[PDB]
Amino acid sequence: GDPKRQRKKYETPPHPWIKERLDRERVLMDKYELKNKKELWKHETQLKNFRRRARRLLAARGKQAEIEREQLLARLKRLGLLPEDAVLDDVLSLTIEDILERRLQTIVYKKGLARTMRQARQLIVHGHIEVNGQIIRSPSYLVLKEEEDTITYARTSPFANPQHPERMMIEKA
| Footprint on this chain of RNA (rule: CB under 7 A) | 1-7, 9, 35-38, 49, 53, 64, 67-68, 71-72, 74-75, 78, 134-138, 141
- Closest to RNA by CB, 5 vs 19, is 5
Shortest distance in whole angstroms from residue 159 CB to RNA? 18
Shortest distance in whole angstroms from residue 96 CB to RNA? 16
Shortest distance in whole angstroms from residue 99 CB to RNA? 14
- Closest to RNA by CB, 67 vs 168, is 67
Neighbours of 40 (CB within 10 A): 17
Neighbours of 164 (CB within 10 A): 14
8 Å CB contact between 82 and 76: yes
- Closest to RNA by CB, 36 vs 163, is 36
Shortest distance in whole angstroms from residue 163 CB to RNA? 29
Torsion sign across C-alpha atoms 117, 119, 122, 128: negative
The Cα 144–Cα 162 span in angstroms is 28
- Closest to RNA by CB, 25 vs 117, is 25
- Closest to RNA by CB, 136 vs 160, is 136
User: b or e along 76-98 (b: 16 or more beta carbons within 10 Å of the residue's beta carbon)?
Assistant: bbebbbbeeeeeeebbeebeeee
Shortest distance in whole angstroms from residue 135 CB to RNA? 7
- CA 120 from chain center: how many Å? 14
